Amino acid sequence: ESLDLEFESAYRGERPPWSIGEPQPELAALIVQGKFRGDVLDVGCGEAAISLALAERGHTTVGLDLSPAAVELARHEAAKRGLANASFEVADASSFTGYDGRFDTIVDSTLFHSMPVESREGYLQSIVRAAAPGASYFVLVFDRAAIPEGPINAVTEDELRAAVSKYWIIDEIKPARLYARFPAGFAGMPALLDIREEPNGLQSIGGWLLSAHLG
Ligand SMILES: Nc1ncnc2c1ncn2[C@@H]1O[C@H](CSCC[C@H](N)C(=O)O)[C@@H](O)[C@H]1O
Ligand SMILES: O=c1ccn(O)c2ccccc12
Ligand code: NA
Numbered sequence: 316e317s318l319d320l321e322f323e324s325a326y327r328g329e330r331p332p333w334s335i336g337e338p339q340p341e342l343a344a345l346i347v348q349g350k351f352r353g354d355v356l357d358v359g360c361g362e363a364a365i366s367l368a369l370a371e372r373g374h375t376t377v378g379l380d381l382s383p384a385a386v387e388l389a390r391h392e393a394a395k396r397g398l399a400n401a402s403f404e405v406a407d408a409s410s411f412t413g414y415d416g417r418f419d420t421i422v423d424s425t426l427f428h429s430m431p432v433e434s435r436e437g438y439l440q441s442i443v444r445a446a447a448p449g450a451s452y453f454v455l456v457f458d459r460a461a462i463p464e465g466p467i468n469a470v471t472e473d474e475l476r477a478a479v480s481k482y483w484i485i486d487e488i489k490p491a492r493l494y495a496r497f498p499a500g501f502a503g504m505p506a507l508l509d510i511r512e513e514p515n516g517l518q519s520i521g522g523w524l525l526s527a528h529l530g
């Protein structure tokens with residue numbers, strides 16, 4: 316019912332498959348299209364490869380994660396790179412304040428399914444409160460067709476639309492790939508999940524890419 320210990324352990328190295336050392340490809344694709352604007356919030360940032368990429372491009376970025384190990388790793392990576400633009404804080408995405416009207420772009424790179432269904436309303440009210448007028452919002456989340464009921468709260472397209480449309484104006488929801496480097500034999504033989512083998516030793520699982528804004 317709570318993943319806090321699991322995420323803390325995965326970041327402490329007791330490396331996470333989703334820590335691919337680059338922003339998620341579906342989200343990098345939006346960055347090159349010029350969709351990321353002004354001050355950015357990387358919500359449930361983890362090791363924050365997307366925050367680092369945006370800070371290198373000139374954005375002032377803030378990454379929030381419930382995991383103190385994730386925050387420390389994100390801060391350690393920004394310091395190795397000599398980034399002054401990127402900051403990180405330990406926070407619960409479902410219930411945080413102190414950033415009223417701050418951000419022009421809010422990105423959720425796989426945080427969405429990493430919290431309980433019941434926490435979604437608190438999370439959506441928190442990020443809207445943290446949004447500047449006319450802010451953009453991007454979500455990359457697992458598809459319920461690929462990830463079953465259990466520790467991960469993956470969504471159907473209709474479920475994602477219903478949840479987010481209450482708070483933001485949705486521009487697009489389209490199928491997407493979530494990339495990771497899984498260990499050999501991950502999820503068994505035969506495999507209990509549909510894991511696609513990708514070029515450059517990567518794997519991917521089915522998901523959704525949502526694009527929204529305030530207007
Ligand atoms: N309630 C919550 N508040 C903030 N972060 C949370 C959270 N629940 C889960 N998380 C974080 O959500 C992340 C999901 S994993 C994805 C991490 C990163 N965005 C990436 O793309 O690599 C983890 O870092 C986890 O600690
Ligand atoms: O194994 C995973 C557990 C949680 N998250 O969010 C992921 C994201 C992308 C790829 C893999 C994972
Ligand atoms: Na969580």
Ligand code: NA
Pocket residue numbers: 464465466467468
């Ligand atoms: Na669950």
Ligand code: NA
Pocket residue numbers: 489490491
């Ligand atoms: Na696509």
